[PDB]
Structure formats: C-alpha cells, structure tokens
Design a protein around this ligand. Structure first.
Ligand SMILES: [Cl-]
Ligand SMILES: [Cl-]
Ligand SMILES: [Cl-]
Lengths: 112, 112, 112
C-alpha cells in the first residue's frame, strides 16, 4: 500500500475529486493548505523578504490505495489537475506499512 | 519509529485524546480535515456529480512513537474512536526514518 | 528523496520560511495545526481531564528535498525555529518513494 499525497489548485480540486470518484476511489482526506503562488495583474510585481515567496491557498488530498492502483491514481490526478501553468502541484508517493479500518479492525489491502 | 496517522469523527476526538493522554502519549498534532460523509434525516438522499461523495469535517491526529508503542497506540485509538457505524475512520502506519527535537537537537527514540 | 515535516511555533514560522527560502528552498506546503501548549500568566495552572493537555495553534511545514539536502534543511529549521523553551517543535524525516510534477510529468530528483 502507498499513501498518495497531491497538492493541487483549488479551481481544479472538483475536477480531481470527480476524476478519482468515477473509478471507485473514495477515502480521500482533504486539507486546506498554503503553497507557492504568483498570479497576474495588470500589476504588480510581488516581492518579499525573505525570499519573495507569497504563500497561497491550495488543496491537499491524501489517498491510501494498494500498490497496483498507484499508477492509475497518479494518471487520474495529473490529467484532472493539469493546466500547463507553473503551480499545478506535485504528487508524492509515500510508503504505508499498514492500514487499520476502525469500524472492522481489518488490516492490509482488504481494509481499503 | 512509526508515524501513526488516524482520521476519526469530531464527536469521538475528545475520547481519543483522553485515551492516549492517560497512557503518557503526548505529542499528537491535530488537523481539521474533510473526509467521506453520509448522515441521517428523516430525509434526503445525498446525490452528487461526480460521484456523489459529500466531503465532511473530520479530525486528523498524527503521533510519532517508537516501534514497540505502535500496537498499544493502535488499540487505544480503535477502541475510543469506534462507534460501529460506517465512517469511524482509518489508521495508517507510516515509517519515520528519524526524529529531531528542536529545543535539544536530540535524535532517535530519546527525542520522543 | 525525503519528506521533511516540522511542527514549529507560529511566531517563528516567518523566521523558518526566511531561513529556507534564502537557500533556494521553495516548495514548502504549510498547514495550521494544533499541538501541545502551556503558556504563562501571572496565572493560572492549566488543568484538564483527560489528561491536562491544551491543544494550541502551531505551524506544519512539509518540504520534499533530495537525500543530500536533508541535513542542510534540518539545520536551517532547528536554528530558525529554536527558542530554548519547551515546545519549539519536532522534525520528522519521512521516506518519499517518488515525486511527480503535474505541469511537466517529471519524476525523481529533477521534479523538485
Ligand atoms: Cl506522507
Ligand atoms: Cl505520512
Ligand atoms: Cl509523512
């Protein structure tokens, strides 16, 4: 089992939740976070000390799937979350040693 | 050392914080998150496109313990967080390679 | 690649963001969390049942760097986040198996 952790745009989150859910992927946990920004104008040049980075609101989705779903889940996120502009987010694959389902006490891939 | 990550009900969080603390487990970090919902009525059937999942407020607790506390911590969470109804949450065991205590610069199991 | 996860003081966060950024470290994701408190007075002794722990607002920063930056990143956080008083926070080193940059589809250390 791997923990998929993707940080995406807020405008693109409904598109990410809709891409995953349509493939039976439920169980995502969502956190409102702040990450690297920028934006447009007409003006002005966003400076800062130190070191000019404006922390802006983004969406963090965490989903724990089986080893064989990982690539399918990755593709679904990149396509739905993509815009082509800098700041579309990142996806991190984090090892998960074991999962425990509270209601049933189930463990392993069955628990998901 | 393992990172325990459990997503529970908000009504059950004081019961989880109270179960852990009574066993000397301090150090938990808590995040307000959203996860899979449902709820009751009398009515109505909660639909949605795509794919009918209502993201609802939950509690995320993260606790970094030594390898030998893991099972004790797991049991304490499942019992306090359990209701028997769908949506009691999940517990993920995530490997933690090393911990650093900022105030002391301590590392390893002593740092916790 | 490792995921650095540090839970620090809110007063010290601008000092942490400024220490990292000055070394080209961008990409941090920030979450408002709650952790172990205490505080001063003149009074009063903060009790509680169970077991007297007051969950207080803190800052969580997550940064995914290459294996060789890990120690440099660790030092920068401890120094900027340190005060000497109990509650300066902790830094956890979590293995990250793979990173995916959404805008480019890049993977590995290049993606960061
Ligand atoms: Cl993780
Ligand atoms: Cl984790
Ligand atoms: Cl982690």
């Amino acid at each position: 089992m791997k923990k998929i952790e993707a940080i995406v745009r807020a405008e693109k989150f409904p598109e990410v939740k809709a891409a995953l859910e349509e493939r039976g992927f439920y169980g995502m946990t969502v956190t409102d976070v702040k990450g690297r920004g920028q934006q447009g104008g007409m003006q002005i040049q966003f400076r800062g000390r130190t070191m000019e980075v404006t922390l802006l609101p983004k969406v963090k989705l965490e989903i724990v799937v089986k080893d064989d779903a990982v690539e399918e889940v990755i593709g679904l996120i990149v396509n739905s979350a993509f815009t082509g502009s800098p700041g579309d987010g990142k996806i991190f694959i984090i090892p998960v040693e074991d999962v425990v389902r509270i209601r049933t006490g189930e463990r392993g891939d069955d628990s998901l």
